[PDB]
């Protein structure tokens with residue numbers, strides 16, 4: 001788990017690089033949402049990982065929100081914080097259960 005200012009995979013900080021990995025994507029969740037939320041696809045099922053915290057997510061379900069799942073599972077992510085803020089992270093945890 002990375003909660004440092006330094007991205008775990010700085011090479012995926014590049015947006016074009018993340019979006020490349022979603023060139024095709026057969027799963028329910030929108031790929032632009034996934035990319036903006038910091039994820040890139042591993043190329044194995046629906047596994048994605050955050051470039052910053054290195055947090056991985058998989059088994060996506062219809063209606064699931066990439067930023068919400070990002071905050072639910074990896075609330076200490078610095079990229080997540082920079083984009084979404086502490087209020088959002090905390091509210092995700094007040095309304096969700098793991």
Ligand SMILES: [Zn+2]
Nearest residue numbers: 050052053077
């Ligand atoms: Zn993250």
